[PDB]
Design an enzyme around this catalytic site. Structure first.
Site, PDB file in Angstrom:
ATOM      1  N   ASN A 145     -12.124  31.114  37.791  1.00 16.33           N
ATOM      2  CA  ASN A 145     -12.638  30.188  38.797  1.00 16.33           C
ATOM      3  C   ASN A 145     -13.401  29.023  38.154  1.00 16.33           C
ATOM      4  O   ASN A 145     -14.598  29.117  37.870  1.00 16.33           O
ATOM      5  CB  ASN A 145     -13.451  30.947  39.844  1.00 16.33           C
ATOM      6  CG  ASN A 145     -14.678  31.646  39.278  1.00 16.33           C
ATOM      7  OD1 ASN A 145     -15.029  31.504  38.111  1.00 16.33           O
ATOM      8  ND2 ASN A 145     -15.351  32.406  40.129  1.00 16.33           N
ATOM      9  N   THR A 146     -12.682  27.925  37.925  1.00 20.02           N
ATOM     10  CA  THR A 146     -13.220  26.606  37.594  1.00 20.02           C
ATOM     11  C   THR A 146     -13.835  26.551  36.204  1.00 20.02           C
ATOM     12  O   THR A 146     -14.151  25.468  35.707  1.00 20.02           O
ATOM     13  CB  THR A 146     -14.263  26.151  38.622  1.00 20.02           C
ATOM     14  OG1 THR A 146     -15.501  26.835  38.389  1.00 20.02           O
ATOM     15  CG2 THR A 146     -13.785  26.401  40.052  1.00 20.02           C
ATOM     16  N   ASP A 194      28.558  38.075  69.374  1.00 21.00           N
ATOM     17  CA  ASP A 194      28.960  39.381  69.942  1.00 21.00           C
ATOM     18  C   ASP A 194      30.170  39.365  70.913  1.00 21.00           C
ATOM     19  O   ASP A 194      30.078  39.665  72.095  1.00 21.00           O
ATOM     20  CB  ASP A 194      27.734  40.070  70.557  1.00 21.00           C
ATOM     21  CG  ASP A 194      27.904  41.594  70.570  1.00 21.00           C
ATOM     22  OD1 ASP A 194      29.040  42.109  70.468  1.00 21.00           O
ATOM     23  OD2 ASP A 194      26.876  42.297  70.623  1.00 21.00           O
ATOM     24  N   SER A 247     -14.307  29.584  32.647  1.00 20.19           N
ATOM     25  CA  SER A 247     -14.615  30.919  32.154  1.00 20.19           C
ATOM     26  C   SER A 247     -13.883  31.163  30.847  1.00 20.19           C
ATOM     27  O   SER A 247     -13.195  30.277  30.334  1.00 20.19           O
ATOM     28  CB  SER A 247     -14.238  31.988  33.176  1.00 20.19           C
ATOM     29  OG  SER A 247     -15.248  32.133  34.156  1.00 20.19           O
ATOM     30  N   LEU A 254      32.735  41.406  80.605  1.00 21.37           N
ATOM     31  CA  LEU A 254      32.590  42.161  81.841  1.00 21.37           C
ATOM     32  C   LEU A 254      33.441  41.540  82.942  1.00 21.37           C
ATOM     33  O   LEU A 254      33.489  40.315  83.081  1.00 21.37           O
ATOM     34  CB  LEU A 254      31.127  42.193  82.280  1.00 21.37           C
ATOM     35  CG  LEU A 254      30.124  42.457  81.161  1.00 21.37           C
ATOM     36  CD1 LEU A 254      28.704  42.342  81.684  1.00 21.37           C
ATOM     37  CD2 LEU A 254      30.367  43.826  80.554  1.00 21.37           C
TER      38      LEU A 254
HETATM   39  C1  LIG Z   1      33.183  51.251  85.867  1.00 23.55           C
HETATM   40  C2  LIG Z   1      31.710  51.060  85.867  1.00 23.55           C
HETATM   41  C3  LIG Z   1      31.293  50.286  84.673  1.00 23.55           C
HETATM   42  N1  LIG Z   1      30.263  49.330  84.923  1.00 23.55           N
HETATM   43  C4  LIG Z   1      29.868  48.590  83.795  1.00 23.55           C
HETATM   44  C5  LIG Z   1      28.912  47.723  83.928  1.00 23.55           C
HETATM   45  C6  LIG Z   1      28.559  47.031  82.829  1.00 23.55           C
HETATM   46  C7  LIG Z   1      27.464  46.037  82.960  1.00 23.55           C
HETATM   47  N2  LIG Z   1      27.225  45.705  84.022  1.00 23.55           N
HETATM   48  N3  LIG Z   1      26.257  44.862  83.826  1.00 23.55           N
HETATM   49  C8  LIG Z   1      25.947  44.736  82.464  1.00 23.55           C
HETATM   50  C9  LIG Z   1      25.077  44.037  81.753  1.00 23.55           C
HETATM   51  C10 LIG Z   1      25.094  44.196  80.459  1.00 23.55           C
HETATM   52  C11 LIG Z   1      25.950  45.026  79.866  1.00 23.55           C
HETATM   53  O1  LIG Z   1      25.878  45.119  78.470  1.00 23.55           O
HETATM   54  C12 LIG Z   1      26.832  45.763  77.757  1.00 23.55           C
HETATM   55  C13 LIG Z   1      28.158  45.086  77.538  1.00 23.55           C
HETATM   56  C14 LIG Z   1      26.075  46.232  76.559  1.00 23.55           C
HETATM   57  C15 LIG Z   1      26.741  47.227  77.448  1.00 23.55           C
HETATM   58  C16 LIG Z   1      26.811  45.717  80.614  1.00 23.55           C
HETATM   59  C17 LIG Z   1      26.837  45.594  81.898  1.00 23.55           C
HETATM   60  N4  LIG Z   1      29.212  47.268  81.658  1.00 23.55           N
HETATM   61  C18 LIG Z   1      30.168  48.186  81.686  1.00 23.55           C
HETATM   62  N5  LIG Z   1      30.462  48.809  82.739  1.00 23.55           N
HETATM   63  C19 LIG Z   1      29.673  49.135  86.213  1.00 23.55           C
HETATM   64  C20 LIG Z   1      30.040  50.283  87.077  1.00 23.55           C
HETATM   65  C21 LIG Z   1      29.677  50.122  88.521  1.00 23.55           C
HETATM   66  O2  LIG Z   1      31.353  50.482  87.007  1.00 23.55           O
HETATM   67  N1  LIG Z   2     -19.286  28.492  23.909  1.00 22.80           N
HETATM   68  C1  LIG Z   2     -18.444  29.185  24.619  1.00 22.80           C
HETATM   69  N2  LIG Z   2     -17.547  28.521  25.349  1.00 22.80           N
HETATM   70  C2  LIG Z   2     -16.721  29.354  26.047  1.00 22.80           C
HETATM   71  C3  LIG Z   2     -16.740  30.733  26.027  1.00 22.80           C
HETATM   72  N3  LIG Z   2     -15.708  31.226  26.838  1.00 22.80           N
HETATM   73  C4  LIG Z   2     -15.145  30.152  27.325  1.00 22.80           C
HETATM   74  N4  LIG Z   2     -15.725  28.980  26.930  1.00 22.80           N
HETATM   75  C5  LIG Z   2     -15.285  27.610  27.286  1.00 22.80           C
HETATM   76  O1  LIG Z   2     -14.267  27.664  28.279  1.00 22.80           O
HETATM   77  C6  LIG Z   2     -13.326  26.620  28.080  1.00 22.80           C
HETATM   78  C7  LIG Z   2     -11.904  27.199  28.085  1.00 22.80           C
HETATM   79  O2  LIG Z   2     -11.180  26.759  29.215  1.00 22.80           O
HETATM   80  P1  LIG Z   2     -11.114  27.622  30.571  1.00 22.80           P
HETATM   81  O3  LIG Z   2     -12.493  27.611  31.127  1.00 22.80           O
HETATM   82  O4  LIG Z   2     -10.396  28.879  30.210  1.00 22.80           O
HETATM   83  O5  LIG Z   2     -10.105  26.631  31.263  1.00 22.80           O
HETATM   84  P2  LIG Z   2     -10.200  26.496  32.822  1.00 22.80           P
HETATM   85  O6  LIG Z   2     -10.392  27.836  33.425  1.00 22.80           O
HETATM   86  O7  LIG Z   2      -8.886  25.897  33.121  1.00 22.80           O
HETATM   87  O8  LIG Z   2     -11.298  25.546  33.047  1.00 22.80           O
HETATM   88  C8  LIG Z   2     -13.676  25.936  26.750  1.00 22.80           C
HETATM   89  O9  LIG Z   2     -14.316  24.697  27.013  1.00 22.80           O
HETATM   90  C9  LIG Z   2     -14.632  26.939  26.094  1.00 22.80           C
HETATM   91  O10 LIG Z   2     -15.578  26.394  25.191  1.00 22.80           O
HETATM   92  C10 LIG Z   2     -17.768  31.394  25.253  1.00 22.80           C
HETATM   93  O11 LIG Z   2     -18.065  32.575  25.148  1.00 22.80           O
HETATM   94  N5  LIG Z   2     -18.581  30.525  24.571  1.00 22.80           N
END
Ligand SMILES: C[C@@H]1CN(c2cc(-c3n[nH]c4ccc(OC5(C)CC5)cc34)ncn2)C[C@H](C)O1
Ligand SMILES: Nc1nc2c(ncn2[C@@H]2O[C@H](COP(=O)(O)OP(=O)(O)O)[C@@H](O)[C@H]2O)c(=O)[nH]1
Length: 1792
Positions: A657-658, A1279, A660, A1286
């Protein structure tokens, strides 16, 4: 003064003086043209009415204010028909109107109608003043100028019953469906007790069908027998199909006095008396255009299912139809409420064979239903049949086949089957309550038994011991324990839901068994494949058992055919490797076992597996980001069978972080001696480095961990999440100088490590001892250790500059921590991969030794070249995973992401592309801040500037959301009164870095909110605030409330109706992100408590406005308050609708009408109540306030998914779409239309007798339209298949027939998948193909189903008429081929395919026969005497000498045989009723009249050699000798009628009875005809030279009509040429050689009553589509032949490439059907194979392939049209228009 004095004196003279005064003023009116009398001469009429002698004079003087009109009609009405004073009146009106037009509207204002109606209808026709009557049509023509005047007077014209004038008004336009649309014409016309002719005329013309149904209800209210039979005849009759479709109507009762005329009647013949109306219409049209221009025979079964017939006895009697019923052969009474089928009926019809009446309320199987003569498929399957159903043994009905008894209340198997139903096959008895053990059941021909859902104890040992053909015994859901010696013939056996403990050995030995489903049993041991004795096991369904082992070690190949093996819900332990031998395995299922844990590599040989559910089981692998699917798992298990090896080469993400010890500690870990750069700068980007470590120890594993010393400075803080994968060992560093204070500020970093990679180790590292506070180990143990921060596993305090042991300890700790990772004991650090990946990695790294520095990218072509350069074992299917896995290891970045676009570019050397992506975030502009801080345009090399920001804004850096106005600009909402806004929080301990950068970039680009008006937005770093208006705005703010170290995400949206849309669409985009990128936050840690780190609050306040505080509520707990809809505190008097504080969870956002209250519910869920399965759930049936309505219940699913489906399937209304009615939150399910006749798959499976080509075309068209709308809605279906389409009604010409279900895949329904738009077109091609096929594609799904994407463009596809035997059906057979292009660019659009399907020609034609190459034929004759299979005998003229040319039709095989020495001209058929032969005769150029036998082509004898070239032959109907008799006519080129007799053809050189030399040498006989009727004794008409003649049994010329002497010369030779054709009808239609006009003579008057020109119909079309026709003024195109239909129309065959339809009655042109040939040479009518009345058309198609050589390539394209064309071209025409109005009216409901 005389004019003044006379007028004033006549005025003051109230008595007497007027009679003379009027005569004085009528004399004087002409001379001075004088000038103030009109008022007084008007006044005197009222002053004394009723005196005729002055009334006539007054009317005579009116012609020389509106009250005028008020007196006029009141005069003419007061004197309706007294004398010819109406003459003077109508003269007055005619004079007045022609100078004051608008006054006409005033006349109709008062009473005009009353008197004109009367005059035009007071029997004036054939009364002597026909010229006065001509003035009156002239009156009416100007009266009916305004169309509204036509409509309203038409209204008045039906009020008073007047047939002639209502017909005249209909011929003049005046549509009859305009009055009220609820009480329109037909309604009151049937209310007011009108005439049948008045109703028939209304129905025949435009009359909307809904109004007809309403009028049917009305006319049912009353008792009418001639108006009902006319309403049905337009509502329910398909004459083309011989049907009665009386289904949907709510007829209270059916009476034969209604259907009487619906049945066909041969006696029906009606005269022409309404010709009066047509003549008056012609006169009115004439005057209007003048004012405009310059002034057997038994029908099929009956519609019967849903009619709630509480009794059917009404047909049992001897009524009018009791003789048509005897040949019914199909009767459906299911779903009514009948009882006790009448005994008289069941013996009245002696040919019924599919009697099915189920769901009725029977209570006793009649047992006298079985005395019918030939019955089968008797089906009573939902009634309440009594406890026992014993069949009376006095009936011996053998013909019964499928005796269904489903779902009754039985208590036994029917008793006396074996003595009554011998040939019984499909005895079904499921759903009953059979309890006792069954009978021995001595049935000799059972083929499919069934006993499902009974209560069986067990089966008698002799139950199946006498049924040697049983095949599909299936006793499901019973209480069954064993099987009694099943006959050795069973193939399919289903025994699920019983109580077994082991497969009874009576099953293990069936010598032919094919499938065995024993699911839901409690069994223990599945015997090994050496116990099954059957070579044909295909399905072995054994789910939900308790199975320990899956024995396959004994002998696996004996099950080599097994294709289905369902073992889910079992106590399995492992899959034995012997499963690798069942190559034919297709659908394995080992899910839900919870104890399997491993897949043997042997399964990689089962390539046929297309599905393999993996629900609730854990594997090695199966890790979603790398986890395979279907065949990809098999590919993985097969590559793992090849060789899997340890990969041992990971990552170390240093984090600081910034400032180290990060770089100066990395440059010390790596022991880097060089010090090339004596002064390192702050880190840019992530600076990936790599350093190998050959650990100099016993473990020679030279591990290579790559270090990514992440950016310290906060500026780089948006991209880092991308480089923090789950697999790592993170460091972290202090800079202990700020000890115990910097250690606090390091807290966010650790938090992010817990956010991204929960199970990743972290190592803290102090970085300073030389800089001085070492008590920091306190706080890291005190605060930082184990409270919401990741699994710290060490901490050190190295110097990280020089001289210490602590660094060696840090090295040792890092090494030992890396070697000890093993998350979930999976050991990342050495896991097995195919060596191919390692080889690819090595070669890629070596190209890190060769690439362009300016652009380190690699193109996919380069990669596919480098794989060729080496010997890599990878295909095009390995790289899609290979490059992804190598991305996982930090070798090369490649982007496959759906959110962006798949990268053709490959980012080897990531170290500089991470470096490049951060250049923009550090370049500043200290010039002129012309734009607000952050927004910028394109301001910077060779084309690289393009790809840079073709990546960065794809990377959503564009306007840079970083370094963007951290301080928020001041914003104020339009309304802030605590009750019009909705507020939701997202309290989280710390924002993710790129959260806002990616959050403001997901909300930003969604411009079409509430769709396309973009909002105004002023967005700082952490807010948006869009606005359309004070009615719609959104502020996704970011504030911190006081005393709250967390950070909230405030969203405020107005509580308006559209605001809830904003809310929902923003919360979706804020939640989907969090689970897509940050799965650690929304991960409920059960360890500890469910903090979830993301406490999405909801803010609600009871006190509307000025609540002084907003009350919190956790969203989850609020979601638990879903059993209600209103929230309320501990104080329950006041409450807030949940519909007021979170309208998005809430149902009300789509049209409010969608709400299911849970009140008037009616439902069931047993396995009869579902209708089918599909996508993410299933569909059932229920009722509510409705009757039948479908319910789509859901699995597992989520209210994410349902929210998509809710919106996306709603707001889409279309006739082809399956609209939904309601949704149910509590029941978690949705509600839909009930599809009445089933699904398209069911229809194909069963009903193949009832799929008409029309019907198939309707379904296709309906579907084409739905798919078009779905692309109007810019979206994929994904699909499309028979299972998904139907059907509602099986009535061909209905308004709704087919619809399409669930929206945006299968082996039976494949495409070349885009990810492996235009794809749905191809899927439609598959469906269309099967509809044309009628069940050919996946009947093979029982047989060889893998093959369904193997022959992909190559299968039975090349000739499907040939490959399935279905009826030929061109144009659409070309349409599927022409649609089905592999390249998506080549496919036509869905709109285009819909348009092509909307083409009557695609529905109307079935074949043509391109004859062999270059054969010229000019004559042909059919064969109707052998109407079984017919051959069409042709001539020839490619040879100057005569060949006959036979041509069959069912074989289509042309044959050639030279029979004459000179070219033929014509042939004819003379069939002899005796001897059973049909001599065929041929006339030729030389006059050699040849006769040859039908079967024998050797018994040939030319008759008398004629003198000139025979032009015609003909066979007549001349039975004038009190017996059956026929003759033959030889038209020669001179007129000599060499007539013969039907029998004399056999003797050589026949004898002409009456040699009638008619014409001359210069006048050639050229055409013959018979008459249209037989009442005139078949007067024969033949054209001769240019003069038509006729004769009879006298065989003498009866007329010598001459045509050249025409008085209407537009041109001469069109009539001054030799005749060509003649047709005999009510009139005569004639044409001559190259005559583009046809002449219409009369038989009696012999006058040219008609002149109909052809090009008079060519103009209308050519003007647009032929622009080169402007150069063709000397047009080819003339009548080459005539062919007249019976009475509907006439077909003109052009000499060009066209054909004309002529409705000879009223309208001239119906349609011209061109572009199918080039020269219509021959045309005739015939009958073929019970498909009688077809019209053959022998046309030409010339090919100018070598036209430069003065030669054309000729193809005689003989085609066969169905003569019923002139109906369908006008009936289908209509049908479009119906569906067009309905296309618009429906879209009104979308508006409102
Ligand atoms: C013969 C019998 C068959 N039937 C049906 C009904 C349907 C049907 N209706 N509405 C739907 C809405 C969605 C749907 O999604 C499917 C294709 C995923 C199954 C089916 C139906 N799909 C087959 N058969 C109705 C009865 C009275 O009659
Ligand atoms: N004197 C000293 N400087 C350190 C030490 N550890 C890291 N630094 C300083 O950390 C810097 C290294 O870059 P770093 O901090 O890793 O890059 P940054 O994270 O991208 O800022 C240098 O300027 C180093 O001198 C340490 O124990 N002693």
């Amino acid at each position: 003064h005389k004019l003044v004095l006379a007028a004033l004196n006549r005025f003051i003279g109230n008595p007497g003086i007027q009679k003379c005064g009027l005569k004085v003023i009528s004399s004087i009116v002409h001379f001075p043209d004088a000038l103030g009398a009109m008022d007084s001469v008007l006044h005197t009429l009222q002053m004394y009415p009723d005196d005729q002698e002055i009334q006539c004079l007054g009317l005579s003087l009116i012609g020389y204010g509106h009250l005028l009109a008020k007196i006029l009609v009141s005069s003419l009405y007061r004197f309706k028909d007294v004398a010819e004073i109406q003459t003077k009146g109508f003269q007055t009106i005619l004079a007045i109107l022609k100078l004051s037009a608008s006054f006409s509207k005033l006349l109709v204002h008062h009473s005009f109608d009353l008197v004109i109606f009367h005059q035009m209808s007071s029997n004036i026709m054939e009364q002597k003043d026909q010229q006065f009557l001509n003035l009156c049509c002239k009156c009416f023509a100007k009266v009916a100028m305004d169309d509204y005047l036509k409509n309203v007077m038409l209204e008045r014209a039906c009020d008073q019953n007047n047939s002639i004038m209502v017909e005249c008004l209909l011929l003049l336009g005046a549509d009859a469906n305009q009055a009220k649309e609820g009480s329109s014409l037909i309604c009151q016309v049937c209310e007011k007790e009108s005439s049948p002719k008045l109703v028939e005329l209304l129905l025949n013309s435009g009359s909307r069908e809904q109004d007809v149904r309403k009028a049917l209800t009305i006319s049912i209210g009353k008792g009418d027998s001639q108006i009902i039979s006319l309403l049905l005849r337009r509502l329910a009759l398909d004459v083309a199909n011989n049907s009665i479709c009386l289904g949907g109507f709510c007829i209270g009762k059916v009476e034969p006095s209604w259907l009487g005329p619906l049945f066909p009647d041969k006696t029906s013949n009606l005269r022409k008396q309404t010709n009066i109306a047509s003549t008056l219409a012609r006169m009115v049209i004439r005057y209007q255009m003048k004012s405009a221009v310059e002034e057997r025979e038994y029908i099929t079964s009956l519609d019967l299912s849903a009619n709630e017939l509480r009794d059917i006895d009404a047909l049992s009697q001897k009524c009018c139809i009791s003789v048509h019923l005897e040949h019914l052969e199909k009767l459906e009474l299911h779903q009514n409420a009948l009882t006790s089928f009448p005994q008289q009926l069941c013996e009245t019809l002696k040919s019924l064979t599919h009697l099915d009446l189920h769901s009725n309320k029977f209570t006793s199987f009649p047992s006298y239903l079985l005395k019918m003569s030939c019955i089968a498929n008797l089906d009573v399957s939902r009634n309440d049949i009594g406890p026992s159903v014993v069949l009376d043994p006095t009936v011996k009905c053998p013909t019964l086949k499928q005796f269904n008894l489903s779902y009754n209340q039985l208590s036994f198997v029917p008793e006396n089957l074996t003595d009554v139903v011998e040939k019984l096959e499909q005895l079904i008895l499921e759903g009953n309550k059979i309890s006792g053990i069954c009978s021995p059941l001595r049935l000799k021909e059972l083929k499919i038994l069934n006993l499902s859902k009974n209560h069986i104890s067990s089966l008698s040992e002799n139950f199946l011991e006498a049924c040697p053909k049983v095949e599909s015994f299936s006793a499901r859901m019973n209480f069954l324990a064993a099987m009694p010696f099943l006959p050795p013939s069973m193939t399919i056996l289903k025994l699920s839901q019983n109580k077994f403990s082991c497969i009874p050995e009576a099953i293990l030995n069936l010598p032919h068994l094919r499938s065995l489903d024993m699911s839901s049993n409690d069994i223990q041991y599945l015997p090994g494949p050496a116990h099954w004795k059957s070579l044909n096991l295909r399905e072995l369904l054994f789910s939900h058992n308790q199975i320990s082992i899956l024995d396959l070690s004994e002998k696996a190949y004996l099950w080599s055919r097994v294709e289905k093996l369902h073992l889910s819900h079992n106590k399995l332990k492992e899959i034995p490797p012997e499963i690798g031998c069942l190559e034919n395995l297709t659908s394995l299922d080992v899910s839900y076992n919870l104890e399997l844990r491993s897949f043997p590599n042997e399964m990689g040989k089962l390539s046929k597996i297309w599905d393999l559910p993996l629900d609730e089981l854990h594997l090695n692998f199966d890790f979603k980001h790398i986890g395979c699917k279907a065949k990809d798992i098999i590919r993985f298990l097969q590559q793992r069978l090849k060789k899997a090896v340890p990969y041992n080469r990971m990552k170390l993400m240093i984090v600081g972080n910034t400032g180290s010890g990060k770089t100066t500690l990395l440059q010390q870990l790596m022991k880097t001696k060089k010090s090339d750069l004596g002064m390192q700068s702050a880190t840019v980007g992530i600076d990936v480095k790599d350093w190998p470590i050959q650990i100099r120890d016993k473990r020679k594993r030279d591990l290579v961990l790559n270090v990514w010393d992440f950016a310290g400075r906060e500026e780089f803080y948006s991209t880092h999440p991308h480089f923090m994968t789950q697999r790592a060992l993170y460091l972290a560093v202090y800079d202990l100088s700020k000890g115990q204070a910097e250690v606090d500020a390091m807290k966010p970093w650790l938090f992010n490590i817990k956010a991204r990679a929960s199970s990743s180790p972290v190592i803290l590292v102090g970085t300073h001892l030389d800089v001085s506070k070492a008590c920091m180990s306190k706080i890291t143990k005190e605060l930082l250790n184990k409270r919401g921060f990741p699994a710290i596993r060490d901490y050190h305090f190295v110097n990280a500059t020089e001289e210490s042991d602590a660094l060696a300890k840090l090295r040792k700790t890092i090494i030992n921590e890396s070697l000890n990772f093993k998350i979930r004991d999976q050991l990342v650090v050495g896991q097995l991969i195919p060596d191919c990946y390692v080889e690819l990695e090595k070669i890629i790294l070596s190209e890190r030794k060769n690439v362009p520095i300016e652009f380190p990218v690699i193109d996919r072509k380069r990669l596919l070249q480098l794989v060729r350069e080496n010997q890599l074992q990878l295909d095009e299917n390995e790289l899609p995973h290979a490059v992804h896995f190598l991305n996982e290891s930090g070798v090369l970045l490649h982007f496959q992401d759906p959110a962006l676009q798949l990268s053709d570019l490959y980012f080897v050397e990531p170290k500089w592309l991470c470096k490049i992506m951060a250049q923009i975030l550090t370049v500043k502009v200290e010039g002129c801040p012309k734009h607000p801080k952050g927004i910028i345009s394109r301001r910077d090399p060779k084309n690289y500037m393009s790809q840079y920001f073709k990546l960065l804004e794809k990377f959503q850096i564009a306007l840079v959301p970083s370094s963007l106005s951290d301080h928020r600009p001041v914003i104020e909402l339009p309304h802030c009164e605590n009750s019009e806004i909705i507020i939701r929080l997202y309290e989280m301990p710390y924002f993710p870095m790129g959260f806002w950068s990616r959050l403001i970039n997901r909300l930003l680009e969604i411009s079409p909110y509430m769709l396309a008006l973009r909002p105004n937005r002023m967005y700082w770093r952490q807010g948006i605030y869009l606005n359309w208006s004070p009615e719609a705005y959104c502020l996704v703010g970011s504030e911190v409330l006081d005393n709250h170290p967390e950070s909230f995400l405030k969203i405020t949206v107005p509580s308006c109706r559209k605001g809830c849309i904003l809310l929902g669409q923003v919360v979706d985009h804020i939640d989907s992100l969090m689970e897509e990128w940050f799965p650690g936050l929304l991960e409920i840690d059960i360890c500890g408590e469910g903090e979830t780190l993301l406490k999405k609050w909801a803010l609600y306040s009871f006190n509307d406005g000025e609540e002084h505080q907003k009350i919190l509520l956790d969203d989850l707990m609020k979601k638990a308050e879903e059993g209600d809809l209103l929230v309320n505190p501990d104080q329950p008097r006041l409450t807030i609708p949940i519909s007021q504080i979170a309208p998005d969870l809430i149902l009300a956002d789509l049209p409010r009408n969608i709400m299911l209250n849970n009140d008037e519910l009616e439902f069931e869920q047993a396995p009869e109540f579902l209708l089918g399965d599909g996508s993410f759930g299933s569909v059932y049936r229920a009722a509510y306030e409705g009757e039948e309505v479908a319910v789509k219940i859901f699995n597992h699913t989520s209210l994410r998914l349902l929210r998509q489906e809710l919106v996306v399937l709603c707001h889409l209304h279309h006739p082809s779409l399956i609209s939904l009615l309601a949704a149910g939150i509590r029941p978690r399910m949705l509600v839909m239309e009930l599809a009445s006749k089933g699904s398209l798959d069911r229809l194909l499976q069963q009903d193949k007798a009832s799929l008409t080509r029309t019907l198939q075309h309707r379904i296709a068209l309906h579907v084409a339209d739905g798919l078009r709308y779905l692309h109007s809605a810019m979206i994929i279906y994904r699909d499309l298949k028979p299972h998904n389409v139907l059907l509602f009604t099986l009535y061909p010409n209905a308004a709704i027939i087919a619809k399409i279900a669930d929206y945006g895949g299968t082996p039976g329904f494949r495409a070349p998948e885009v990810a492996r738009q235009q794809a749905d077109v191809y899927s439609f091609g598959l469906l269309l193909y099967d509809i044309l096929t009628t069940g050919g594609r996946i009947v093979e799904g029982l047989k060889f189903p893998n093959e369904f994407d193997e022959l992909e463009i190559q299968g039975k596809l090349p000739d499907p008429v040939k490959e399935y035997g279905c009826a030929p059906w061109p144009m659409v057979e070309k349409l599927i081929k022409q649609c089905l292009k592999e390249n998506p660019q080549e496919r036509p659009t869905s709109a285009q395919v819909f348009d092509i399907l909307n083409s009557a020609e695609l529905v109307c034609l079935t074949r043509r026969i391109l004859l062999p190459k270059n054969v010229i034929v000019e004559c042909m004759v059919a064969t109707h005497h052998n109407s079984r299979n017919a051959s069409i005998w042709l001539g020839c003229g490619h040879t100057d000498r005569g060949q006959l040319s036979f041509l069959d039709l069912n074989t289509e095989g042309y044959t050639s045989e030279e029979v004459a020495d000179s070219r033929i001209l014509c042939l004819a058929l003379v069939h002899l009723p005796v001897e059973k032969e049909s001599w065929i005769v041929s006339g030729t150029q030389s006059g050699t009249l040849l006769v040859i036998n039908t079967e024998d082509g050797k018994k040939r004898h030319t008759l008398e050699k004629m003198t000139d070239s025979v032009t015609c032959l003909y066979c007549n109907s001349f039975s004038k000798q009190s017996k059956q008799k026929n003759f033959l006519l030889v038209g020669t080129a001179d007129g000599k009628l060499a007539i013969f007799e039907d029998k004399t053809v056999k003797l050589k050189g026949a004898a002409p009875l009456k040699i009638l030399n008619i014409g001359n040498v210069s006048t050639p006989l050229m055409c013959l005809s018979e008459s249209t009727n037989s009442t005139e004794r078949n007067v024969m008409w033949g054209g001769c030279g240019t003069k038509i003649f006729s004769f009879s049994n006298d065989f003498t010329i009866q007329k010598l009509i001459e045509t050249r002497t025409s008085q209407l010369f537009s041109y001469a030779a069109f009539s001054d040429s030799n005749i060509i054709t003649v047709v005999v009808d009510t009139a005569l239609y004639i044409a001559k050689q190259n005559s583009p006009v046809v002449e219409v003579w009369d038989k009696k008057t012999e006058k040219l009553c008609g002149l109909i020109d052809c090009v008079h119909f060519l103009r209308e079309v050519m003007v647009k589509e032929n622009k080169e026709s402007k150069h063709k003024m000397s047009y080819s195109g003339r009548v080459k032949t005539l062919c007249l239909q019976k009475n509907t129309a006439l077909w003109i065959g052009t000499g060009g490439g066209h054909i004309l339809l002529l409705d000879l009655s009223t309208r001239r042109l119906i349609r011209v059907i061109y572009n199918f040939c080039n020269s219509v040479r021959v045309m005739m009518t015939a009958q073929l194979g019970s498909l009688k009345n077809v019209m053959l058309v022998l046309g030409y198609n010339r090919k100018n392939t070598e036209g430069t050589q003065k030669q054309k390539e000729i193809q005689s394209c003989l085609t066969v049209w169905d003569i019923n064309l002139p109906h369908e071209v006008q009936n289908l025409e209509k049908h479009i228009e119906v569906r067009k109005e309905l296309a618009e009216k429906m879209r009104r409901t979308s508006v409102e």
